[PDB]
């Protein structure tokens, strides 16, 4: 029922920008918070930030403050993450994850992740 | 803050195993809303535990979260082959989440 859909991959050039999408289905989009997480081979997970889709309020990991922009499109119930001035260190798998703020405080459902490869 | 987890743990089918999550800054309390997430082959993530001990709908009853000493802990009672995966814990520190390095759990069949 609950589904977070993310496109498979992004092959982009050093210095470009990418917009990642996470389409939510099977639940009321504005009732749960949406988070973005980065995964790099052997470097575990890094929290980028989250967005409350009802108000548009964001909170970011200070390391990604000047790199990432989170927005939502309520009518289409899609969450977006824009990454600018990409470098090789930006090549990773990026996940969107729903967080039950008003309920039990878990990251219950995760998208499949978008693999971003920054290459010339 | 740095969140630390055991690197790798090995168990056998039917055994009881416990994984821990330690904070750099002191004791893990209920104000850290400890989360346990599981990564299965093929980058498949599922949330197991949230807010220290709340099990997500659909998670088998053999997974339980608690605070043991000055650490968040994930206990698997009667480990199965399907439980071989990477377990990540995450701690909330007032305005940001910090993820541990993950624990690779090997279930020897
Ligand atoms: C109320 C329950 N508190 C929590 O679940 C912890 C809590 C607080 C705040 I403010 C948050 O922004 C988040 N988060 O972003 O996921 C978590």
From Swiss-Prot, chain B:
**What intrachain disulfides are recorded?**
none
Residue limits of the Ig-like domain?
1-105
Top-rank taxon, per record: Eukaryota
Any Gene Ontology biological process:
adaptive immune response
Q: Which UniProt keywords apply?
A: Adaptive immunity, Immunity, Immunoglobulin, Pyrrolidone carboxylic acid, Signal
Mind telling me which GO cellular component terms the entry cites?
immunoglobulin complex
Q: What else is known?
A: Compositions and partial sequences of RPC 20 show no differences from MOPC 104E. The sequences of J558 and S104 seems identical with that shown.
Quote the protein name from its UniProt record.
Ig lambda-1 chain V regions MOPC 104E/RPC20/J558/S104
Species per Swiss-Prot/TrEMBL record: Mus musculus
Covered part of the full sequence, start to end and full length, is 21 to 128 of 129
